[PDB]
Design a protein around this ligand. Structure first.
Ligand SMILES: CCCCCCCCCCCCCC(=O)CSCCNC(=O)CCNC(=O)[C@H](O)C(C)(C)COP(=O)(O)OP(=O)(O)OC[C@H]1O[C@@H](n2cnc3c(N)ncnc32)[C@H](O)[C@@H]1OP(=O)(O)O
Ligand SMILES: Cc1nn(C)c(C)c1NS(=O)(=O)c1c(Cl)cc(-c2ccnc(N3CCNCC3)c2)cc1Cl
Ligand SMILES: [Cl-]
Ligand SMILES: [Mg+2]
Length: 385
């Protein structure tokens, strides 16, 4: 595979190896003055569209495009189905720009056929803090694949991010591109095991009968940390200190302001779940997970897999194992079928004892225009949506 597009870009070549002594841009001294003011050209019959994510109709068009054309599993049974309310939350964080929510319409039918988006955040990479763009939800309609529209969308969002004097981005993908700074597998913890088997997400074996699998994944409906409760606005300062202080140990992590903590953590039903343990007016433990369902295609019984994805979890009054056992419990109480986590932060250490199973492939973390040492995923301290 040649990466004829990617090799024109400020990113590492497949064989590039940098020491820990290197931690800087590939291209520095960039000038907002010099950024191209013209939109990149689209094939005949197609146009840029500025998406207003706070307009329910524009949002619903993005929602439809992703519902029909986003990430599918290797066998093509499952397709991610981010909710409209989810997309609102994911793309209207503090200081977001409307002009980084970019669609492409096919003129003749006025239908949206392409999308890419970014949001601004401060990213600390090997102890340097850089204002970056966080790029997500790149999607080209399934009918228009391998026509090189993705590189158009990418060069256009790059241009619009550069116009804000920002020159670095972070992004994740399942595909291998030049070149991951880290690489983390998904692990899956079955909650509704019979449904997971019936939809073909998990399996059994003569060793393991349906009843025995159900017993294996059975959980006690009692928290290790008995006062774990939904987060509220009063807990923003406390979570800002607990999470902020925790994250500083990692090689890569978002440096959250208090406004960002409110946005990213305050709970939204069917979007984001954050629980806290408050002890003497201090927040001492937190659990958070987000809702990302998969549409189940062509099943007579089920149309939706409800999945909870581990987001940020910190404990100071229990073991990490006990905290994540509580996270699984909290996802079960909210009627989630499976709890997913990446082998980042301290997550791997709990996967065997908590009966997680290893997933297929992995999620690659990337930076744009940044040269640095790569590292093991335990050193990663950021989870993108
Ligand atoms: C300073 C600011 C900088 C801002 C930008 C930072 C960079 C942000 C980068 C974006 C981060 C997104 C992160 C994200 O959203 C989360 S990862 C999920 C991405 N979305 C999907 O998988 C949805 C299902 N697939 C599709 O919609 C299409 O297959 C897409 C649109 C993905 C590719 O459409 P297509 O019809 O299949 O392909 P062509 O148009 O013919 O394009 C082929 C070229 O596309 C390169 N490609 C393929 N998949 C990619 C991927 N996931 N990242 C980056 N590049 C990807 C590919 O390597 C090749 O270049 P090469 O010839 O060099 O290999
Ligand atoms: C049930 C189901 N529904 N679908 C759609 C799939 C693929 C599955 N199978 S899975 O659950 O076992 C699983 C899971 Cl959770 C996640 C990844 C993974 C791979 C690559 N990229 C991303 N992202 C890209 C951008 N940020 C969002 C995450 C996720 C792969 C698998 Cl295979
Ligand atoms: Cl060009
Ligand atoms: Mg294409």
């Amino acid at each position: 595979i040649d990466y004829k597009f990617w090799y024109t870009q400020p990113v590492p070549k497949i064989n590039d190896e940098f020491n820990e002594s290197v931690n800087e841009p590939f291209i520095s001294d960039n000038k907002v003055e010099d950024v191209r003011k013209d939109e990149y050209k689209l094939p005949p019959g197609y146009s840029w569209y500025v998406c207003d994510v706070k307009d329910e109709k524009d949002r619903s068009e993005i929602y439809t495009l992703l519902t029909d054309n986003y990430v599918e599993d290797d066998d093509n049974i499952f397709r991610f189905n981010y909710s409209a309310e989810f997309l609102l939350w994911a793309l209207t964080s503090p200081n977001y720009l409307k002009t980084w929510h970019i669609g492409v319409k096919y003129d003749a039918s006025n239908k949206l056929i392409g999308f890419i988006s970014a949001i601004p955040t401060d990213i600390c990479i090997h102890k340097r803090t850089i204002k970056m763009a966080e790029v997500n939800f790149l999607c080209v309609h399934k009918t228009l694949r391998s026509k090189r529209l993705a590189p158009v969308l990418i060069k256009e969002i790059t241009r619009r991010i550069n116009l804000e004097n920002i020159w670095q981005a972070i992004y994740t993908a399942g595909v291998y591109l030049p070149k991951p700074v880290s690489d983390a597998r998904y692990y899956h913890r079955s909650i509704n095991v019979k449904k997971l088997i019936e939809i073909g997400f998990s399996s059994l074996n003569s060793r393991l009968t349906m009843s025995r699998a159900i017993k294996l994944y059975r959980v006690e409906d009692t928290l290790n940390i008995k006062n774990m409760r939904l987060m509220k606005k009063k807990d923003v300062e406390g979570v800002h200190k607990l999470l902020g202080s925790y994250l500083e140990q990692f090689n890569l992590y978002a440096v959250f302001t208090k406004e960002e903590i409110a946005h990213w953590f305050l709970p939204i039903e069917n979007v984001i779940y954050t629980y806290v343990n408050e002890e003497n007016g201090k927040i001492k433990d937190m659990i958070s997970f987000y809702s990302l369902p998969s549409q189940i295609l062509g099943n007579d019984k089920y149309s939706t897999l409800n999945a909870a994805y581990s987001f940020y979890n910190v404990t100071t009054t229990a073991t990490f194992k006990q905290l994540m056992q509580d996270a699984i419990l909290l996802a079960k109480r909210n009627n989630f079928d499976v709890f997913n986590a990446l082998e980042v932060m301290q997550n791997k250490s709990v996967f065997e004892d908590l009966k997680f199973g290893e997933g297929d492939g992995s999620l690659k973390y990337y930076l744009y225009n940044w040269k640095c040492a790569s590292f093991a995923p335990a050193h990663v301290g950021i989870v993108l949506l």
